[PDB]
Amino acid sequence: DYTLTREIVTDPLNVFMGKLNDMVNWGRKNSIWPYNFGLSCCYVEMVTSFTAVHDVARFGAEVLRASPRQADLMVVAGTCFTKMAPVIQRLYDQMLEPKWVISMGACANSGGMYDIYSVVQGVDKFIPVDVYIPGCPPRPEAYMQALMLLQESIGKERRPLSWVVGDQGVYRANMQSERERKRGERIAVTNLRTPDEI
Amino acid sequence: WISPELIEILLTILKAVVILLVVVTCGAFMSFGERRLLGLFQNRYGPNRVGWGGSLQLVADMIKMFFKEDWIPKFSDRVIFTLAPMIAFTSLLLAFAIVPVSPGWVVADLNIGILFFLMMAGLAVYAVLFAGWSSNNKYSLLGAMRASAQTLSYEVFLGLSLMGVVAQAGSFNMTDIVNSQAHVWNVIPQFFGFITFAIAGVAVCHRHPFDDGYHIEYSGMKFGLFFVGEYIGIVTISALMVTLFFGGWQGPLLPPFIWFALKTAFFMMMFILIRASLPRPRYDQVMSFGWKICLPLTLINLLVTAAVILWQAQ
Amino acid sequence: MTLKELLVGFGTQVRSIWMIGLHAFAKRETRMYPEEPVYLPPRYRGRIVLTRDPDGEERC
Amino acid sequence: STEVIAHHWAFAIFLIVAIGLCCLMLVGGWFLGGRARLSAKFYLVAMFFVIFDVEALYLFAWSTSIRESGWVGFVEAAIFIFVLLAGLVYLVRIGALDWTP
Amino acid sequence: VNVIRVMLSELFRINSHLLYISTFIQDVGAMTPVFFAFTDRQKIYDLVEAITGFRMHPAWFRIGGVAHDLPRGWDRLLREFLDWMPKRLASYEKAALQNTILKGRSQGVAAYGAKEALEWGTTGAGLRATGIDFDVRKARPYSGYENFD
Amino acid sequence: MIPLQHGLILAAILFVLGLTGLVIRRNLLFMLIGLEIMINASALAFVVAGSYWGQTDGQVMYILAISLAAAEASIGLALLLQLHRRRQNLNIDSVSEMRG
Ligand SMILES: CCCCCCCCCCCCCCCCCC(=O)OC[C@H](COP(=O)(O)OCCN)OC(=O)CCCCCCCCCCCCCCCCC
Numbered sequence: 001d002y003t004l005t006r007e008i009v010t011d012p013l014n015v016f017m018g019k020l021n022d023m024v025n026w027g028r029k030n031s032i033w034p035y036n037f038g039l040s041c042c043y044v045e046m047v048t049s050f051t052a053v054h055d056v057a058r059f060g061a062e063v064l065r066a067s068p069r070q071a072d073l074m075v076v077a078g079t080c081f082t083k084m085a086p087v088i089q090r091l092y093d094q095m096l097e098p099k100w101v102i103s104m105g106a107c108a109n110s111g112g113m114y115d116i117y118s119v120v121q122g123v124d125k126f127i128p129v130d131v132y133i134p135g136c137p138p139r140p141e142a143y144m145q146a147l148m149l150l151q152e153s154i155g156k157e158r159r160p161l162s163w164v165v166g167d168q169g170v171y172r173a174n175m176q177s178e179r180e181r182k183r184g185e186r187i188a189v190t191n192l193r194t195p196d197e198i
Numbered sequence: 199w200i201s202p203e204l205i206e207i208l209l210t211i212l213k214a215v216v217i218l219l220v221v222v223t224c225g226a227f228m229s230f231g232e233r234r235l236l237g238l239f240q241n242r243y244g245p246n247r248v249g250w251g252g253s254l255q256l257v258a259d260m261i262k263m264f265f266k267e268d269w270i271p272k273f274s275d276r277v278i279f280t281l282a283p284m285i286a287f288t289s290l291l292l293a294f295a296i297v298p299v300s301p302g303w304v305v306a307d308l309n310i311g312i313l314f315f316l317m318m319a320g321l322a323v324y325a326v327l328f329a330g331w332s333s334n335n336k337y338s339l340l341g342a343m344r345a346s347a348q349t350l351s352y353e354v355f356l357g358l359s360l361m362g363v364v365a366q367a368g369s370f371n372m373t374d375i376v377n378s379q380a381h382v383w384n385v386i387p388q389f390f391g392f393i394t395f396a397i398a399g400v401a402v403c404h405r406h407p408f409d410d411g412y413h414i415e416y417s418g419m420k421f422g423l424f425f426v427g428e429y430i431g432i433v434t435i436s437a438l439m440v441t442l443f444f445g446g447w448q449g450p451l452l453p454p455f456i457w458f459a460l461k462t463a464f465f466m467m468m469f470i471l472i473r474a475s476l477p478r479p480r481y482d483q484v485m486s487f488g489w490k491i492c493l494p495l496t497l498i499n500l501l502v503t504a505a506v507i508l509w510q511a512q
Numbered sequence: 513m514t515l516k517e518l519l520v521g522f523g524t525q526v527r528s529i530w531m532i533g534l535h536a537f538a539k540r541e542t543r544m545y546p547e548e549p550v551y552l553p554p555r556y557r558g559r560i561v562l563t564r565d566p567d568g569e570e571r572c
Numbered sequence: 573s574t575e576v577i578a579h580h581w582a583f584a585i586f587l588i589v590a591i592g593l594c595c596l597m598l599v600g601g602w603f604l605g606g607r608a609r610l611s612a613k614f615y616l617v618a619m620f621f622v623i624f625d626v627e628a629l630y631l632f633a634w635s636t637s638i639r640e641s642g643w644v645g646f647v648e649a650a651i652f653i654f655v656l657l658a659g660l661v662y663l664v665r666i667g668a669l670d671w672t673p
Numbered sequence: 674v675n676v677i678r679v680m681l682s683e684l685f686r687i688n689s690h691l692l693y694i695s696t697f698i699q700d701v702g703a704m705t706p707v708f709f710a711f712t713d714r715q716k717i718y719d720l721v722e723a724i725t726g727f728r729m730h731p732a733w734f735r736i737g738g739v740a741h742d743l744p745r746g747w748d749r750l751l752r753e754f755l756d757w758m759p760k761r762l763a764s765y766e767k768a769a770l771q772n773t774i775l776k777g778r779s780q781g782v783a784a785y786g787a788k789e790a791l792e793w794g795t796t797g798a799g800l801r802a803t804g805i806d807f808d809v810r811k812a813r814p815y816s817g818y819e820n821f822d
Numbered sequence: 823m824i825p826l827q828h829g830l831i832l833a834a835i836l837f838v839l840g841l842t843g844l845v846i847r848r849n850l851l852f853m854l855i856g857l858e859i860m861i862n863a864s865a866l867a868f869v870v871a872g873s874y875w876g877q878t879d880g881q882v883m884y885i886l887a888i889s890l891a892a893a894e895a896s897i898g899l900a901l902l903l904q905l906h907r908r909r910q911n912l913n914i915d916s917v918s919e920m921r922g
């Protein structure tokens with residue numbers, strides 16, 4: 001199942017157009033360029049993921065552009081403060097299609113622990129979000145797992161190949177949640193190591 | 199339609215086309231190799247998951263640049279904004295156009311050569327100036343003025359660095375320059391010419407440590423044009439240094455193209471090492487190094503080369 | 513600048529060149545995520561569960 | 573000589589294919605994908621580049637024919653390079669090439 | 674409790690100082706050693722993960738003590754980290770902090786004396802760089818810092 | 823196989839175009855542009871004359887001509903910068919305070 005942005009609409013996908021959309025999706029997931037935007041702690045773990053021990057570069061996401069026009073993905077990693085929310089909105093509007101959003105950490109997810117007068121309670125209040133990571137902060141490999149989640153969501157989305165022909169609306173698949181996908185193996189856990197050891 | 203002249207025309211045009219395609223693909227794959235070698239230099243692996251050895255990453259970047267939405271500022275001048283990546287690509291491409299890769303494999307056997315490289319360097323600084331002005335941005339304009347002043351400050355002695363090599367060779371032709379290296383490579387007499395040409399060639403390609411930017415407004419395939427043009431420029435500078443200081447294709451055992459490609463790859467890896475290791479000197483220090491130190495060194499090197507080549511001309 | 517300062521600068525840059533090359537000749541310290549699973553200590557604060565008693569009923 | 577005209581044609585198709593490849597690369601980038609006061613030191617640096625580039629072209633003309641010009645050409649270019657270095661030292665000392673204050 | 678709190682505070686101080694030095698080296702223009710500094714921070718994070726269960730915000734100190742006891746094997750990880758650190762510190766110093774370009778970019782920039790630090794409430798490395806030997810761990814000892822050499 | 827006359831006509835056309843641009847334009851930058859057009863046209867004529875006779879003297883005086891053009895353009899652009907610095911406008915009709 002898919003949803004439209006110009007409602008729920010089924011999968012429309014000639015085989016040559018299907019292969020062309022598949023290769024466009026492949027090139028888009030295998031080359032995702034994040035934007036160098038810093039808000040708070042979660043950006044420190046973001047640049048931790050970019051470093052040598054973690055090596056985001058294996059995903060081809062180390063290019064890390066300093067201008068939003070050159071970036072494909074916006075990782076909101078930190079708290080959406082009231083003063084910083086117009087900056088976030090302007091930065092997201094400066095981007096070009098296609099543009100996806102990864103919300104990193106509890107602050108960008110929902111406001112986190114900061115149910116306070118000067119914090120916007122979640123970045124999804126004003127900009128659309130594609131992936132959410134719980135954490136405070138998420139570890140760098142959780143950001144990597146979200147990068148693969150965004151790759152999976154990218155690889156089965158439908159976008160126009162050009163503006164001269166075809167439908168110009170975007171089709172994002174209603175993905176099965178990771179919670180119900182991993183519930184089979186998460187409940188089967190029986191014993192864990194006791195916290196008194198290393 | 200079978201004649202030796204016409205088939206020679208067609209085969210030589212095919213060699214030129216093959217050289218052009220290999221050069222543009224080598225620049226793109228060596229940008230990918232720049233990422234990989236930076237990862238190696240900082241104890242990582244770099245892009246190695248998209249394809250066998252990461253070789254399919256570049257196709258993914260090309261697809262992303264091609265299918266990105268094309269964006270031009272409304273207030274900007276469209277013609278200059280379009281034209282600046284065109285120049286930044288083509289200038290260093292036709293700068294490569296003089297390089298002899300192997301005996302019997304050349305594009306144009308000109309009577310000028312490195313003069314044509316100098317014209318292409320002037321066109322490169324034109325590309326930087328046009329990219330800065332066309333953005334309709336004061337910050338990018340000022341940054342382009344600074345970058346263009348630096349490029350001028352090193353282009354002012356690029357040719358004088360090459361002057362010792364052509365003075366020993368006795369001709370502007372590149373084949374004669376290589377053939378003068380049949381017994382000793384030009385790096386040994388023109389050591390100062392070599393280091394000054396290396397510094398100038400790094401600076402005119404805006405490679406580290408010589409890099410309010412003038413690339414902020416560019417996006418889509420124009421930014422990819424800038425990258426492939428600058429990396430083709432890295433290829434061109436490396437091949438020029440090989441063919442002017444390290445004997446070109448001359449080698450004892452291996453085929454000449456193998457030796458030429460090995461030396462070019464060594465200089466490419468050296469450029470990646472320069473990018474990885476050195477910190478960035480300040481702008482005033484960079485231009486004072488360009489004017490005060492290297493240009494008198496090239497002048498004195500040319501004078502000493504002339505005196506030596508007249509002493510041995512008994 | 514002075515010639516001694518220039519020679520010291522050239523020496524420091526060549527030393528940085530050599531040290532970065534020696535870093536290149538070293539051993540990688542990169543964890544191969546997701547292919548290599550992340551080791552986590554037993555008291556690592558990640559996903560929350562509700563557990564059971566040894567008899568099999570839920571402990572809450 | 574068919575080799576000379578062959579090399580001329582190779583240069584022609586090299587130029588044409590390079591420019592056209594960049595043209596069609598820009599065309600394909602545009603076509604595909606959906607949509608939804610400066611100081612006078614700049615002038616001084618460019619001016620110094622122009623003047624020293626003309627003196628550089630004089631040295632370019634010198635260096636290609638050093639051997640048959642003899643030692644007289646060497647002493648002539650020695651006066652030339654000494655004049656260039658005197659002007660360069662003069663420019664350096666007064667602060668023309670000093671960007672920092 | 675005092676020695677545990679001092680150990681955790683010193684581990685996090687080393688983490689923060691490593692980040693500060695690496696970010697300064699990157700901001701000057703040498704972007705290489707921040708990666709290795711983050712590897713050292715990852716070793717510190719390994720020890721902090723083992724002890725407190727979290728990487729960056731442990732939430733481990735309690736009113737009257739700490740949340741858990743020290744896990745069996747904390748001393749091995751601490752010994753491995755203490756063997757790891759000095760060679761990396763010397764490597765970063767000789768690769769970047771003794772290089773001339775960073776010294777020229779850093780020396781003589783935004784200097785001030787003791788009076789400017791006193792009147793503006795400057796503390797930490799700046800105040801002691803002005804020659805005033807005022808550290809809280811020595812002047813007003815806390816958490817058993819008087820038992821450390 | 824290429825007439826000397828045709829190159830001379832081309833150089834003369836460029837010269838009169840530069841002179842017309844020098845006369846009709848009252849912005850100082852376009853006057854300097856016209857000056858470089860005329861001096862380049864005369865240099866082109868000199869190169870054509872040298873190539874007709876098979877002598878290097880045409881290229882030698884071309885080298886002298888472009889040296890003069892470079893230095894004169896530098897001086898003229900310095901004067902233009904001074905005019906724009908002190909008067910904030912590039913009207914060549916504004917510099918008319920000496921007359922009679
Ligand atoms: C946006 C487009 C702008 C314009 C771009 C160019 C448009 C034209 C493209 C088609 C050109 C067709 C072929 C032209 C002739 C090529 C061969 C040639 O030049 O031969 C003449 C000469 C031969 O010399 P040689 O080989 O030594 O022969 C021995 C003596 N018989 O060899 C020479 O004299 C070599 C020296 C001349 C080489 C000229 C190369 C092009 C110069 C202009 C580049 C412009 C780049 C784009 C714009 C940059 C920004 C302004």
Ligand SMILES: CCCCCCCCCCCCCCCCCCCC
Pocket residue numbers: 216217220221224299300303433453455458459462463
């Ligand atoms: C970085 C190097 C870029 C080189 C660009 C041009 C490549 C030309 C390749 C020519 C190959 C044939 C050379 C002559 C025959 C001898 C070798 C035969 C096996 C390749």
Ligand code: SF4
Pocket residue numbers: 040041042077078079104105106107108112135136137138
């Ligand atoms: S979620 Fe936690 S770690 Fe992330 S920005 Fe908020 S307070 Fe910091």
